[PDB]
Ligand binder design. Structure first.
Ligand SMILES: Cc1cc2cc(Oc3ccnc(Nc4cccc(CS(=O)(=O)NCCN(C)C)c4)n3)ccc2[nH]1
Length: 306
């Protein structure tokens, strides 16, 4: 039996902020009657994300497509509190080009609605898989290596922003990266729109955990830091440069798997990774967390390669 819990954490000193104690800045408030909902984009056991037209949003009074996060009508008070905490974290962090940004919220007069940017091309994992199939078909445009480097660089920039705000993501993976206009990548947390209870990428342990993405110190000691996010980012790189294979393909998560990772087992070079991109992956998988690259080092390196 899983609970709906706040994914991201903010470091205080590791001491973490209690997000329930953060303030909600009413500058974000938007009238719920000024949303016209469209299709549901995804739904899980606790809520869903629905596209909508927002009328008069922002300083320019834009009329635009947005995405709206919401809980099920039957949500417990504990879950409504978690959605508010997620809202407060987004307001605390500020905006960046390579994250899925907060645009507004509806907190009065009904259930809490969190309004974010809408990303026209959906998640990166499905995008890469569908593009791979489109490219094999002949036997819109095809992917090239520079596209993969751009996606990778853009995610690293968004993560460098989060790290600069002392924010830990804890579920870095291609399924949590979206592509927007111009195929620009943005990192976010879309667990609410994901069917996690029936998702083979989350393993029951202790909690449903994305074990194949997790650093050994997270698996064994439940330690989460920016450096454990860097490990997960290395797994994301492997996803990108394999065009969306599952990590550790074909390997069952069991005691042997946990031991192998703790002892230094690493995936082999993906089919489309240049040697030095695989070397970055290996660097992200250093067993000593402080030996891993920073997101700024990753960003600068990948920007150069692109
Ligand atoms: C794996 C997954 C991540 C995820 C994130 C979600 O929250 C968000 C948040 C912001 N944006 C979007 N944009 C968005 C999400 C899913 C589908 C689409 C439309 S599409 O499939 O890429 N192209 C349209 C296809 N049809 C019209 C032909 C956009 N999802 C919503 C559902 C999600 N599913």
């Amino acid at each position: 039996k899983p609970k709906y819990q706040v994914r991201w954490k903010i470091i205080e000193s590791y001491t973490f902020i209690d997000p329930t104690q953060l303030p909600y800045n009413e500058k974000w408030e938007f009238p719920r009657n000024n949303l016209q909902f469209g299709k549901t984009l995804g739904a899980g056991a606790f809520g869903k994300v629905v596209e909508a037209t927002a009328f008069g949003l922002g300083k320019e009074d834009a009329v635009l497509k947005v995405a709206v996060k919401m809980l099920k009508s039957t949500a417990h008070a504990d879950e409504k509190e978690a959605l508010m905490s997620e809202l407060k974290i987004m307001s605390h962090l500020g905006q960046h080009e390579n994250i899925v940004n907060l645009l507004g919220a509806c907190t009065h007069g009904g259930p809490v609605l969190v309004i974010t940017e809408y990303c026209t091309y959906g998640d990166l994992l499905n995008f890469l898989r569908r593009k791979a199939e489109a490219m094999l078909g002949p036997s819109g445009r095809p992917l090239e290596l520079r596209d993969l480097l751009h996606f990778s660089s853009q995610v690293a920039q968004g993560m460098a922003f989060l790290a600069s705000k002392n924010c830990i993501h804890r579920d870095v993976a291609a399924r949590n990266v979206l592509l927007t206009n111009g195929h620009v990548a943005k990192i976010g947390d879309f667990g609410l729109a994901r069917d996690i209870m029936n998702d083979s990428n989350y393993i029951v342990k202790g909690a449903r955990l994305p074990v194949k993405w997790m650093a050994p110190e997270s698996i064994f000691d439940s330690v989460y830091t920016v450096q454990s996010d860097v490990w997960s980012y290395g797994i994301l790189l492997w996803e990108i440069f394999s065009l969306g294979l599952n990590p550790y393909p074909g390997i069952l998560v069991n005691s042997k798997f946990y031991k192998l990772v703790k002892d230094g087992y690493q995936m082999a070079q993906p089919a489309f990774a240049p040697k030095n991109i695989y070397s970055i992956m290996q660097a992200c998988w250093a067993l000593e967390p402080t030996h891993r690259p920073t997101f700024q080092q990753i960003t600068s390196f990948l920007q150069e390669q692109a």
